[PDB]
C-alpha cells in the first residue's frame, strides 16, 4: 500500500468508484462499502484522478465535484467525508 | 326471499368446484412463499411479477 510501491507497480489511473446505495445494501453491507471506498481512495496518488458516483434508480454524484478531480489530500478528504454520509434507500438500476 | 331469476350460477356451485378452489388457494399460498422481502423499498424482478399475478388471484376469489 505504500506510495513508492503503488507508484512503481502500475501507471496513473482515471478511477470512477461507483457505489451502490440501493435499498438492499442497507445494514452491514453499507458500512463495509463505506469503509472499503475509503480504504480504496487511500491507494491513490496525485497523478491519478478519481470521482465517486452513486446509483439507486438514479445515478448522481456523491459530492460537489461532478467530474474527475486530481485525488490529492484535500480532494480525497472531501470524497471520504461525502461517502461517510451515504444512506441506502430505493431500487437498483445498473443501466443508469 | 329472492326468486330464481338471479340463479344463473347456482347450478355450477355443486360441480367439482371446491377442487378448483382448493387448488387455486394453493397456488396463492405458494405465491406468498416465494415472495422475497427486501429492505427499504427495494425490489427485484420476480417480486414485481408476483404483484401483478395477485390481481389474478384477487379476481377468482
Ligand atoms: C420434516 C419437515 C419438512 C419441512 C417442509 C416444509 C416445507 C418445505 C420448506 C419450504 C420449501 O421447500 O421451499 C419454499 C419454496 C419458496 O421459496 P424458495 O424458492 O424455497 O426460497 C429459497 C431461497 N434461497 O417453495 C414453496 O414455498 C413451497 C412451500 C409450500 C407452501 C405451503 C404448503 C401449502 C400449505 C399446506 C399444504 C402443504
Swiss-Prot record, chain A:
Assembly description: Dimer formed of alpha-2-1 and delta-1 chains; disulfide-linked. Voltage-dependent calcium channels are multisubunit complexes, consisting of alpha-1 (CACNA1), alpha-2 (CACNA2D), beta (CACNB) and delta (CACNA2D) subunits in a 1:1:1:1 ratio.
Biological role stated in the UniProt entry: The alpha-2/delta subunit of voltage-dependent calcium channels regulates calcium current density and activation/inactivation kinetics of the calcium channel. Plays an important role in excitation-contraction coupling.
Glycosylation positions in this chain: 85
Family: Belongs to the calcium channel subunit alpha-2/delta family.
PTM per Swiss-Prot/TrEMBL: Proteolytically processed into subunits alpha-2-1 and delta-1 that are disulfide-linked.
Location in the cell: Membrane; Cell membrane
Binding residues annotated for a divalent metal cation, in chain numbering: 20, 22, 24
Tissue: Skeletal muscle.
First-to-last residue of the parent protein present: 242 to 337 of 1106
Top-rank lineage group of the source organism: Eukaryota
Motif (MIDAS-like motif): 20-24
Record comment regarding domains: The MIDAS-like motif in the VWFA domain binds divalent metal cations and is required to promote trafficking of the alpha-1 (CACNA1) subunit to the plasma membrane by an integrin-like switch.
Organism whose genome encodes this protein: Oryctolagus cuniculus (Rabbit)
Protein name (Swiss-Prot/TrEMBL): Voltage-dependent calcium channel subunit alpha-2/delta-1
Note: Binds gabapentin, an antiepileptic drug.
From Swiss-Prot, chain B:
General function of this protein: Pore-forming, alpha-1S subunit of the voltage-gated calcium channel that gives rise to L-type calcium currents in skeletal muscle. Calcium channels containing the alpha-1S subunit play an important role in excitation-contraction coupling in skeletal muscle via their interaction with RYR1, which triggers Ca(2+) release from the sarcplasmic reticulum and ultimately results in muscle contraction. Long-lasting (L-type) calcium channels belong to the 'high-voltage activated' (HVA) group.
Similarity annotation: Belongs to the calcium channel alpha-1 subunit (TC 1.A.1.11) family. CACNA1S subfamily.
Tissue distribution of the protein: Detected in skeletal muscle T-tubules (at protein level).
Lineage top rank: taxon: Eukaryota
Residue spans, topological domain Extracellular: 35-49
Modifications made to the protein after synthesis: Phosphorylated. Phosphorylation by PKA activates the calcium channel. Both the minor and major forms are phosphorylated in vitro by PKA.
Residues shown, of full length: 37 to 97 of 1873
Residues with glycosylation annotation: 43
UniProt subcellular location: Cell membrane, Sarcolemma, T-tubule
Listed name of the protein: Voltage-dependent L-type calcium channel subunit alpha-1S
Assembly mode: Component of a calcium channel complex consisting of a pore-forming alpha subunit (CACNA1S) and the ancillary subunits CACNB1 or CACNB2, CACNG1 and CACNA2D1. The channel complex contains alpha, beta, gamma and delta subunits in a 1:1:1:1 ratio, i.e. it contains either CACNB1 or CACNB2. CACNA1S channel activity is modulated by the auxiliary subunits (CACNB1 or CACNB2, CACNG1 and CACNA2D1). Interacts with DYSF and JSRP1. Interacts with RYR1. Interacts with STAC, STAC2 and STAC3 (via their SH3 domains). Interaction with STAC3 promotes expression at the cell membrane.
Notes concerning its domains: Each of the four internal repeats contains five hydrophobic transmembrane segments (S1, S2, S3, S5, S6) and one positively charged transmembrane segment (S4). S4 segments probably represent the voltage-sensor and are characterized by a series of positively charged amino acids at every third position.
TM region positions: 16-34
